[PDB]
Amino acid sequence: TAADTTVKTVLTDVTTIKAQMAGVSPLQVPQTDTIANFVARLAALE
Amino acid sequence: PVVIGGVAMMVAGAGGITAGAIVLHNSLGARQDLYQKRSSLNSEVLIATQIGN
Numbered sequence: 001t002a003a004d005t006t007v008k009t010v011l012t013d014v015t016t017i018k019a020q021m022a023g024v025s026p027l028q029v030p031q032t033d034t035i036a037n038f039v040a041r042l043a044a045l046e
Numbered sequence: 047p048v049v050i051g052g053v054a055m056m057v058a059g060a061g062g063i064t065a066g067a068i069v070l071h072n073s074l075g076a077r078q079d080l081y082q083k084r085s086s087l088n089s090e091v092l093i094a095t096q097i098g099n
Binding site: 035038039 | 085088
């Protein structure tokens with residue numbers, strides 16, 4: 001009976017791992033430098 | 047001796063005012079040319095490096 005209860009628990013363990021491993025992460029576009037800014041940063045310091 | 051040295055000063059000075067004007071009209075323009083040319087060059091060099099990156 002305990003064995004039967006445990007299989008329920010195993011089914012839980014399995015839905016946890018399936019949730020952990022689902023999805024395809026989408027593209028991330030970083031924010032990258034323009035000339036405008038690199039120049040504004042290098043003329044700032046000097 | 048001193049009246050002469052006095053007048054010579056004012057003449058010097060006056061030539062110094064009259065010369066410093068010639069030079070300030072015939073320079074201000076040329077200085078903005080040179081800075082713009084310099085900034086142009088910095089920008090273009092960076093663009094070249096960016097293309098390489």
